Amino acid sequence: SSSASVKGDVIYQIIIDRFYDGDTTNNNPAKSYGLYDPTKSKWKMYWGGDLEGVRQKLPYLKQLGVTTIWLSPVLDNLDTLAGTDNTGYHGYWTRDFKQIEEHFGNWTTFDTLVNDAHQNGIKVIVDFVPNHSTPFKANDSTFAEGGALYNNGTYMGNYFDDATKGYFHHNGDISNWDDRYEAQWKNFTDPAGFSLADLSQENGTIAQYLTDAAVQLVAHGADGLRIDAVKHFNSGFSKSLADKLYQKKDIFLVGEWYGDDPGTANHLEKVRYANNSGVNVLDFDLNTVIRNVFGTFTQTMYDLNNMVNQTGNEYKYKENLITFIDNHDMSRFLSVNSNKANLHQALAFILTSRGTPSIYYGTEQYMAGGNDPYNRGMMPAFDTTTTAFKEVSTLAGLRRNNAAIQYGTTTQRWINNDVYIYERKFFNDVVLVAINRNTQSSYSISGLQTALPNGSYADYLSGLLGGNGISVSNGSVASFTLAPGAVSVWQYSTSASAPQIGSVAPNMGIPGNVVTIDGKGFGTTQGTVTFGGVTATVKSWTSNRIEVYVPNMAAGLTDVKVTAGGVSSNLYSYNILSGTQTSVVFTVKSAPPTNLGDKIYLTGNIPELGNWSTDTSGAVNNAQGPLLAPNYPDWFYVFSVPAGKTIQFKFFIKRADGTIQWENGSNHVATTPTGATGNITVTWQN
Ligand SMILES: OC[C@H]1O[C@H](O[C@H]2[C@H](O)[C@@H](O)[C@@H](O)O[C@@H]2CO)[C@H](O)[C@@H](O)[C@@H]1O
Ligand SMILES: OC[C@H]1O[C@H](O[C@H]2[C@H](O)[C@@H](O)[C@@H](O)O[C@@H]2CO)[C@H](O)[C@@H](O)[C@@H]1O
Numbered sequence: 001s002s003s004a005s006v007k008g009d010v011i012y013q014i015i016i017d018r019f020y021d022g023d024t025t026n027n028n029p030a031k032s033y034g035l036y037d038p039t040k041s042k043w044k045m046y047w048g049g050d051l052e053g054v055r056q057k058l059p060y061l062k063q064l065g066v067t068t069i070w071l072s073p074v075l076d077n078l079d080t081l082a083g084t085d086n087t088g089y090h091g092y093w094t095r096d097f098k099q100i101e102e103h104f105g106n107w108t109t110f111d112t113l114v115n116d117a118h119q120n121g122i123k124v125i126v127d128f129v130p131n132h133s134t135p136f137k138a139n140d141s142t143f144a145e146g147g148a149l150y151n152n153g154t155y156m157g158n159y160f161d162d163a164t165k166g167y168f169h170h171n172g173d174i175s176n177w178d179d180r181y182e183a184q185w186k187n188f189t190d191p192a193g194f195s196l197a198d199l200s201q202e203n204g205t206i207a208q209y210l211t212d213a214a215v216q217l218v219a220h221g222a223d224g225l226r227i228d229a230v231k232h233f234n235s236g237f238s239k240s241l242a243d244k245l246y247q248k249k250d251i252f253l254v255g256e257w258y259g260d261d262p263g264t265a266n267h268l269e270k271v272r273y274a275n276n277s278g279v280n281v282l283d284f285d286l287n288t289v290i291r292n293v294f295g296t297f298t299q300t301m302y303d304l305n306n307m308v309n310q311t312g313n314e315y316k317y318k319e320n321l322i323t324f325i326d327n328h329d330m331s332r333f334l335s336v337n338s339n340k341a342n343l344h345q346a347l348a349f350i351l352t353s354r355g356t357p358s359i360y361y362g363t364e365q366y367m368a369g370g371n372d373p374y375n376r377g378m379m380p381a382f383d384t385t386t387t388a389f390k391e392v393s394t395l396a397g398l399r400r401n402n403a404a405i406q407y408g409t410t411t412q413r414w415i416n417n418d419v420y421i422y423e424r425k426f427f428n429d430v431v432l433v434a435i436n437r438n439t440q441s442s443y444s445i446s447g448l449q450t451a452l453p454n455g456s457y458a459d460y461l462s463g464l465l466g467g468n469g470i471s472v473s474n475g476s477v478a479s480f481t482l483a484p485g486a487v488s489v490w491q492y493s494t495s496a497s498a499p500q501i502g503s504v505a506p507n508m509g510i511p512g513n514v515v516t517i518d519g520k521g522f523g524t525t526q527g528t529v530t531f532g533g534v535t536a537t538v539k540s541w542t543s544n545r546i547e548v549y550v551p552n553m554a555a556g557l558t559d560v561k562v563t564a565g566g567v568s569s570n571l572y573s574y575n576i577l578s579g580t581q582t583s584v585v586f587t588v589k590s591a592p593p594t595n596l597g598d599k600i601y602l603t604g605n606i607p608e609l610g611n612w613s614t615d616t617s618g619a620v621n622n623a624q625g626p627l628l629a630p631n632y633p634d635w636f637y638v639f640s641v642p643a644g645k646t647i648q649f650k651f652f653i654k655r656a657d658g659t660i661q662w663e664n665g666s667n668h669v670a671t672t673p674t675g676a677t678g679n680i681t682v683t684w685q686n
């Protein structure tokens with residue numbers, strides 16, 4: 001379906017309470033009375049935006065070029081205050097994952113918005129927050145709701161009556177946010193003076209409950225999810241949850257793995273997650289550099305190109321990275337740099353670069369504001385004539401129509417500290433983009449080379465951002481002047497004469513799932529699709545999109561190929577799992593002594609466990625881990641494995657110097673749980 005890939009889309013991120021109040025009657029419900037501020041002066045209270053308000057502004061969003069709305073969390077949040085004028089208006093403090101937040105509407109309202117968005121050709125992804133329930137103080141159960149969790153109104157438990165349930169972790173507050181065990185098993189804290197009750201995704205009831213709640217959003221039409229705080233809960237559950245969701249529908253998943261940029265200690269773990277979990281990630285690596293290049297001017301275009309190259313080498317599916325200039329957790333771009341041309345340039349960069357852009361609501365209306373909560377002001381106007389509105393609409397159309405933006409390679413063609421001219425290319429489709437961030441200097445551009453075919457090219461933006469026309473002859477662009485602060489875009493597209501795969505999505509699943517192949521040149525007459533040479537059953541076949549069912553074949557990463565008119569396409573990978581997954585805590589007791597830098601990994605006889613690999617790079621299906629060691633010399637971590645299956649596995653130490661020390665003896669043998677979760681505990685064999 002169209003939900004599988006968002007490569008041709010523009011994502012628009014909406015903080016529901018601060019967008020549009022389409023129904024004033026749900027502003028201050030009796031269920032959660034007293035959390036509403038009609039004056040819009042108390043920044044952490046509900047101001048009244050809702051799901052009906054989003055639905056009423058669909059014509060505006062369609063005209064802007066939005067093709068996927070990322071809705072901030074829609075599920076029932078804390079019904080009380082959490083300290084002085086502080087409320088769950090943002091949606092990250094969930095008390096009931098089965099019900100829509102009453103300030104925003106009910107399930108009928110959600111269905112109506114989603115159905116109306118789909119009628120307007122716009123998808124809806126939902127921000128889903130599995131890490132925690134609500135604010136609590138460990139020494140006082142009367143604060144807020146004490147972390148209370150409900151199941152469609154039926155009370156489940158809170159932080160204080162959990163002794164015989166184990167729905168929450170009880171390990172204290174995070175102290176070192178970069179310590180992986182703390183970041184996942186200790187509590188998320190808020191500087192306002194409280195902690196968030198940390199759900200135990202290792203508890204079977206909670207894992208199935210969260211799975212059911214995510215599946216319910218998809219059953220109600222959601223086209224995918226933006227999964228909150230994926231660095232804060234075990235990554236086995238991210239992969240097992242993604243499995244369940246792709247069994248339901250070929251939706252799109254992206255996880256927010258905050259920070260951990262290149263060169264940092266936990267960066268490789270984030271890359272491995274993006275490459276193996278079945279969940280794509282938001283592009284924090286590129287965001288940092290975009291803000292320093294176009295915002296603070298502390299980095300240059302060389303740093304921007306270096307980050308495009310570095311992310312391109314690390315992420316297997318870099319075209320699934322979700323890019324952004326700002327969001328609800330950092331100051332708005334215009335509070336970093338109020339120059340609107342620099343904002344226009346940053347927007348053009350993400351609109352034409354690899355991955356799919358996410359534009360934070362109101363960017364196109366020139367909203368400004370410091371960090372949370374001041375970057376969550378009310379959408380001020382719905383003016384369709386701003387330069388930013390016109391730019392986004394125009395470039396969104398280029399992204400929908402030119403395959404080079406969706407799937408293309410990226411090549412640097414001209415660069416200095418201020419100017420970046422890069423080229424996207426997908427077979428014969430080419431887009432050459434020139435950006436000059438310096439608003440006070442023009443540059444003479446000579447020696448520019450391109451893959452554009454011969455001819456004269458007008459700026460696709462029609463000079464909106466100061467762009468100019470160019471003349472191309474045998475791969476050479478005639479010398480021209482790039483104006484101060486300008487953005488200029490030159491493009492070529494044509495029909496394909498052979499099958500060309502731009503995307504296969506989702507990137508993981510089991511036999512029988514629906515998988516979508518997006519591209520060009522498939523023809524109108526049905527041809528064939530193979531996975532590793534195995535013929536797949538075709539569900540639908542069009543010139544640019546094929547839907548297939550994953551064949552009942554052996555598990556592992558395999559190559560998808562399209563054959564049309566006797567000619568075969570390029571290959572694109574797809575990870576076939578060994579069966580529906582379960583998320584399992586693997587513990588190895590009494591392992592041998594280690595030194596700082598030495599880490600233990602798990603490997604075994606299935607692709608989920610690496611097929612006996614000892615490789616620990618960003619590759620797909622290699623050794624699993626590393627394990628953590630809060631209970632050293634015992635080590636543990638949580639991994640997604642096929643449910644109800646007998647597996648063989650061993651652990652190994654990867655010393656700081658790269659040396660490998662395997663457990664001795666015979667392989668450990670175990671049968672995995674049949675439910676959502678379970679535990680497999682063994683003793684290191686000496
Ligand atoms: O109470 C802590 C914090 O909760 C929310 O922050 C989110 C953030 O917006 C997400 O993007 C991610 O980083 O996880 C956090 C917890 O879900 C609120 O948005 C923030 O105001 C509040 O301080
Ligand atoms: O002519 C091919 C050459 O083009 C570009 O080099 C630019 C350089 O980026 C600018 O800073 C300036 O010095 O003009 C040069 C062209 O004369 C590419 O960046 C380079 O890779 C390529 O070889």
Ligand SMILES: OC[C@H]1O[C@H](O[C@H]2[C@H](O)[C@@H](O)[C@@H](O)O[C@@H]2CO)[C@H](O)[C@@H](O)[C@@H]1O
Nearest residue numbers: 611612648649650662663664665666667
């Ligand atoms: O390479 C496949 C092989 O991997 C594992 O064998 C390990 C063994 O456990 C270690 O003790 C040491 O001998 O290295 C071997 C890998 O070279 C599995 O145990 C074995 O079943 C599997 O075939």
Ligand SMILES: OC[C@H]1O[C@H](O[C@H]2[C@H](O)[C@@H](O)[C@H](O)O[C@@H]2CO)[C@H](O)[C@@H](O)[C@@H]1O
Nearest residue numbers: 177178183229231232257258259260329
């Ligand atoms: O400031 C709120 C954010 O806190 C955390 O961010 C951590 C980050 O994970 C860690 O890598 C860095 O070293 O420290 C910061 C701040 O303590 C959360 O992970 C974010 O989601 C929050 O927005």
Ligand SMILES: [Ca+2]
Nearest residue numbers: 023027048050
């Ligand atoms: Ca309202």
Ligand SMILES: [Ca+2]
Nearest residue numbers: 032076077078
């Ligand atoms: Ca509520």
Ligand SMILES: [Ca+2]
Nearest residue numbers: 184198232233
């Ligand atoms: Ca957690």
